Nucleic acid binder design. Structure first.
Lengths: 207, 119, 54, 114, 7, 122
RNA sequence: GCACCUCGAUGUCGGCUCAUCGCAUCCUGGGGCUGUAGUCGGUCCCAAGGGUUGGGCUGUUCGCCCAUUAAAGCGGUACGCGAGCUGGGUUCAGAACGUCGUGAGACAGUUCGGUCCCUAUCCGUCGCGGGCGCAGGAAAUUUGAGAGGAGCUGUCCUUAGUACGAGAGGACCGGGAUGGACGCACCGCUGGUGUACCAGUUGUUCUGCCAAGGGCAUCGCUGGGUAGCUAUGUGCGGACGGGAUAAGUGCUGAAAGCAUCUAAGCAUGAAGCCCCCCUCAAGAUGAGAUUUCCCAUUCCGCAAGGAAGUAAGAUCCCUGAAAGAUGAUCAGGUUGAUAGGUCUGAGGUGGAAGUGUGGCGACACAUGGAGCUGACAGAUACUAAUCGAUCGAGGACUUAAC
RNA sequence: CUCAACGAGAGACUCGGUGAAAUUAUAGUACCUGUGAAGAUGCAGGUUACCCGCGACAGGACGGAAAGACCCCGUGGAGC
RNA sequence: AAUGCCGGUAUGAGUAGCGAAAGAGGGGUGAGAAUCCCCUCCACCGAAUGCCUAAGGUUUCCUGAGGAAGGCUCGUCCGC
């Protein structure tokens, strides 16, 4: 498999080869430098480390500076592993760019979703709402916790809490256009997360 | 997003106009820190309105400056003070006409106080 | 909404573990001291980096 | 949003005439019926102009056989072949939601000639 | 009856 | 966005004037239908001269809504009224004449005769 | 039926909200026998994975009817759930009708109306933190013991009007599209909202007056609307598949020279199971693994060990949001764009004030896509993120090679 | 409501000041299946669970509040 | 061991509440100021939230000091 990880900028619309109008998500995801190659005889599994969005030396630690010394590159903000890529096909310090994806391919997009704060059960779990009239004092409440006989609430009872901030994967999106000059990926559909957050684009599980 | 400061929007506008004008006459006031943070952008916007010096900017500033006397035994209003002293004082400076310096907490309610001054 | 049993002394003291409050961010004032909490004007001398501004 | 502008600058439709949200014009729409593509004319007054660069959309309203038809196009689509402004109207606002209930002379007395 | 009407 | 108990005017020469929706025929299922869907409906108001009488439970297909129907090219269409055409349980209309404009989305389905009998297809 | 528990109180029907469990299975999946020609069927097996509706009547469960659907399944959980909700009916105090009673009054006969309290201590559940451990202190990246989520299906076209059938009728299997419900994300569109955005307008008061504005009248009202949040909007998912299987179908075969699905050995076989799809996961005290930094000070305690300063690193304090009740997380702290201001833009609103022209005037036109602009961008240290302080290791013992 | 989504204010959240009440055998106070005065946080067998908090929900503690109002008994009473 | 009587002290717990509805700034006093005094804006009532006059209260009215307790916080202030 193949993949690359970067920052998304925002959404736009692009018409392509017909009159049809396509919702397009823009992702800056290049260049990515291979930092570490995981091997089965040493680490127990096969993976590669990709680094993205290098930063100033003031914001990087001495272990972070020493970890990227082997790849001959600046310390980078985002490090994630890809598993399992076609071993080996990449050497340590080789730049991964957006040219690996053609503009007709099917990819998997994952990322940390937008935070919503501590929210009620109606918004967090999609639970239906109580009546506002005919004497009713009941609305926006989670419901009965369960029966009487267990003398307890069963685990998994849906209750208000914090929504968002979790990893969400959207499957089988399509690349609309690839921009090798400006390091941009144009992806059909919606992408989870807020603006300028980390987005990982990996090849889909075919077929 | 702007702060609400525990007030109604009309009360917010009235209190911000009062604090802006009172800073414009007395040149140094002592409020809470969040009131200072909400006040400084409005005050530098009104100083920017005073920078232009034309009649339309003065009529824009007249909708915000309250009618209190600025300079005694001169009959100078605050609206005249913006276009006579503050604009000529801050002609070279591009923004940052106010600074906020924090003080200790208040005795009665633990409110963190701040010094606001025109610089 | 009614307590079934009273709280014992040990459970009350265990709940009051985090009720304590911390030492403020107090530092040496370069003018006189002592001492001055960080990012505020000193109440003794009225100075802040480093002019007497009161 | 300057990167979105640099992305979509190549696909902007710059040959279209400038039109205000209160005038009448005809839209040459290319429709695919199979196999021949006729170009039907949609004459009517512009109601909306909601901006956004490549996301700009405009709404044209006409009265056809006693039933009003509102049709919204994106500005830079290739489905529109040609836009001709019939006459310029004099309006007081950018959104003309009032005239979709004012049949029939009450819309004519508001859409006067400019 | 068992009517819950405690006051 | 045609719902149960939505009153639509009837846009053909069948005789009915106003009709009330009973059920959307799609699935178990939905409570909303937009354009090209067939709905079971009952006649509330009708002309004295016509084959369709008051109170008959008939089937009709929606031809006009004020909800904006979306097309693949990013375009939108919407009307100022909700209209429908009564059919004989297949896709042939009762009336010999059709009044008012007709949306193009009936052509995507096999609704050829209602489109051909329409005075204007948008 | 009995009266074992509760009368120093165990709130009782029907609905709303939230569910969970068992199949004696309503559909979907796989089969046997059919008086199964094919479609549709009947009966009996294996199968709880998922789904099992919108109304009219009645307080009603139930039931009848209308329109669908793949089907509108039975039950248990104090006839689940009132310190989660409603009191329509039962079930108080008023008043009637019919009947009984001389009467006061009575009626699982009817009707009208009729006070539903609780600030959560503990266990449970849903989220978020602070400690300590993981034999040195740290910064990252991670394997997965385990756990949770998802699991549904309709219609159309081919094969094929083929097999079958006198005809009417009409496939199994295998492909390709398009839907319904549900779920996850996100608004680029379509809309909603948007109380520090723009414009119009009414009454009164104020800035001495005209003009121009401010206050209040629900944001005074009305018409729009940036960001954010949103669905009714958009994109995507339940795909293709492996292993052992249930009911069945069997192969080779003897007990029992035959026969035989089985007692040994091999298969095939379901929306069940365990994975492949997604997510949390080493407090998994069984505390795992890889990469890279910091080093082995001083003073006591003869041994164990204990204090002070520090390196790598982190925190107090401050600017803030892509985060957020508070903690926490993330971007940053003067070799720098973290926030505000300033400038230039995007978008919104719609043609500001003043001046001039035409008119008796209300008003219109030109200057002029003007003026104004809250959270949206890009530049710019002008202002605030000052000086500072605190925490943070000298690495136990055996065994095989070094 | 289908079917709910935003916006404003007060409480709820944080900090400063002040500061109760109902209740309370002691309490280091998990779950399943049974047993038992026949419906278990404390019993038996097993399965899980580092220590201490903060914000929420209300299934249980046959929760609290009133020596049940219904039913029965008293050789009790009162009104008709 | 009486849902006993009286007194003291806990639990809940630094928890609920702090009782409709506009405040802001500059000076002054003072050991101590968000709450007291003065000034300038802003706001509210205005067939009253204005004036007085019964019933009623009875010193609560004025001045100068004071702040223990009472102002549901503070207090240099008060109907103390």
């Amino acid at each position: 498999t193949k993949g690359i990880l970067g920052r998304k900028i925002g959404m736009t619309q692009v018409f392509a080869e017909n009159g049809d109008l396509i919702p397009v998500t823009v992702i800056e995801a290049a260049p990515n430098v291979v930092l570490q190659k995981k091997t089965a005889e040493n680490d127990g599994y096969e993976a590669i480390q990709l680094g993205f969005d290098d930063k100033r030396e003031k914001l990087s630690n001495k272990p972070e500076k020493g970890h990227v010394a082997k790849a001959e590159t600046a310390p980078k903000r985002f490090v994630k592993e890809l598993r399992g890529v076609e071993m080996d096909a990449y050497e340590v310090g080789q730049e991964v760019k957006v040219e690996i994806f053609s503009a007709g391919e099917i990819v998997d997009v994952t990322g940390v979703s937008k935070g919503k704060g501590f929210q009620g059960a109606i918004k967090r779990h999609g639970q239906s709402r109580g009546p506002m009239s005919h004497g009713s004092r009941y609305h926006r409440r989670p419901g009965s916790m369960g029966p009487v006989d267990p003398n307890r609430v069963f685990k998994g009872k849906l209750l208000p809490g914090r929504m968002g901030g979790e990893q969400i994967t959207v499957q089988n999106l399509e690349i609309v256009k690839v921009d090798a000059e400006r390091n941009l990926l144009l992806i059909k559909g919606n992408v989870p997360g807020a603006k300028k957050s980390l987005i990982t684009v990996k090849s889909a599980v075919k077929s | 997003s702007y702060r609400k400061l525990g007030r109604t929007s009309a009360q917010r506008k009235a209190m911000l106009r009062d604090l802006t004008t009172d800073l414009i006459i007395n040149e140094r006031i002592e409020t809470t820190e969040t009131r200072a943070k909400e006040l400084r952008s409005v005050v530098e916007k009104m100083i920017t309105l005073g920078k232009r010096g034309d009649l339309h900017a003065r009529r824009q500033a007249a909708a915000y400056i309250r009618n209190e006397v600025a300079n005694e035994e001169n009959n100078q209003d605050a609206l005249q003070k913006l276009f006579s002293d503050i604009a000529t004082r801050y002609e070279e400076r591009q923004g940052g006409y106010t600074r906020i310096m924090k003080l200790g907490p208040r005795r009665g309610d633990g409110a963190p106080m701040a010094i606001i001054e025109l610089v | 909404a009614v307590p079934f049993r009273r709280t014992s002394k040990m459970k009350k003291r265990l709940r009051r573990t985090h009720f304590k409050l911390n030492v403020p961010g107090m530092t040496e004032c370069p003018s006189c001291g002592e001492m001055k909490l960080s990012h505020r004007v000193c109440k003794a001398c009225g100075s802040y980096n480093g002019k007497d501004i009161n | 949003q300057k990167l979105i502008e640099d992305i979509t600058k190549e696909q902007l439709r710059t040959d279209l005439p400038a039109f205000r949200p209160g005038d009448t014009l005809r839209v040459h729409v290319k429709v695919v019926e199979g196999n021949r593509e006729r170009i039907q004319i949609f004459e009517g007054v512009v109601i909306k102009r909601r901006g956004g660069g490549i996301s700009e959309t405009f709404t044209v309203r006409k009265i056809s056989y006693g039933v009003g038809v509102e049709r919204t196009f994106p500005v830079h689509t290739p489905k529109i072949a040609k836009i001709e402004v019939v006459r310029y109207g004099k309006v007081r606002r950018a959104k003309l939601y009032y005239l979709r209930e004012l049949r029939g002379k009450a819309a004519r007395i508001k859409e006067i000639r400019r | 009856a068992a009517a819950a009407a405690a006051a | 966005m045609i719902q149960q108990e939505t009153r639509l005017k009837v846009a053909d020469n069948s005789g009915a004037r106003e009709v009330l929706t009973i059920k959307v025929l799609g699935g178990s299922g939905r409570k909303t239908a937009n354009i090209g869907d067939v709905i079971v409906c009952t006649v509330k108001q009708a002309t004295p001269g016509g084959v369709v009488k008051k109170g008959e439970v008939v089937k009709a297909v929606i031809v006009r809504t004020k909800s904006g129907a979306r097309r693949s090219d990013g375009s939108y269409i919407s009307f100022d009224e909700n209209a429908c055409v009564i059919i004989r349980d297949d896709k042939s209309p009762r009336g010999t004449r059709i009044f008012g404009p007709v949306a193009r989305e009936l052509r995507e389905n096999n609704f050829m005769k209602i489109v051909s009998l329409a005075p204007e297809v948008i």
